[PDB]
Amino acid sequence: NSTEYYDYEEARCACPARHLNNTNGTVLKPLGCHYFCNGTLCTAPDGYPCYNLTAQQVRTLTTYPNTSCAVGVCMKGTCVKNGTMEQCFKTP
């Protein structure tokens, strides 16, 4: 399609994003399914892992494994919880 150019939108979203750590040796996961690259709002691809925390819960996050975080999978920019809970925390 000569009239359509998606590469710029994708290139704008190819920056690393902060992920939270956990204690049971699973992959690092971001808070929800959106992230910012140089001010641009970006959405994680469908199937990407995520943590789903309410706003209250987000305030209780520390650098220690004292928060139980619901694991989810990204779908259309929503972190769909899958039932797994793990102790997640911020990495200094």
Partner: protein, 65 residues
């Protein structure tokens, strides 16, 4: 590691502005090479792409220590 790549930059690696590079944590779901420009832009790349593999092979001395 604090950060992981969710997408790969498919374009041309910006060699003229390149300053350092690193490989994200093994606990990231997507294995990635991150190129960092002099102004600090960080660019996720596919470690299996031929141009990325060659760039990290000959630009070994640029790797984050």
């Amino acid at each position: 590691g604090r950060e992981c790549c969710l997408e790969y930059f498919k374009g041309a690696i910006p060699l003229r502005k390149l300053k350092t590079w690193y490989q994200t944590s093994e606990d990231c779901s997507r294995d990635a090479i991150v190129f960092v420009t002099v102004q600090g832009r960080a660019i996720c790349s596919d470690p299996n792409n031929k141009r990325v593999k060659n760039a990290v092979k000959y630009l070994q001395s640029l790797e984050r220590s």
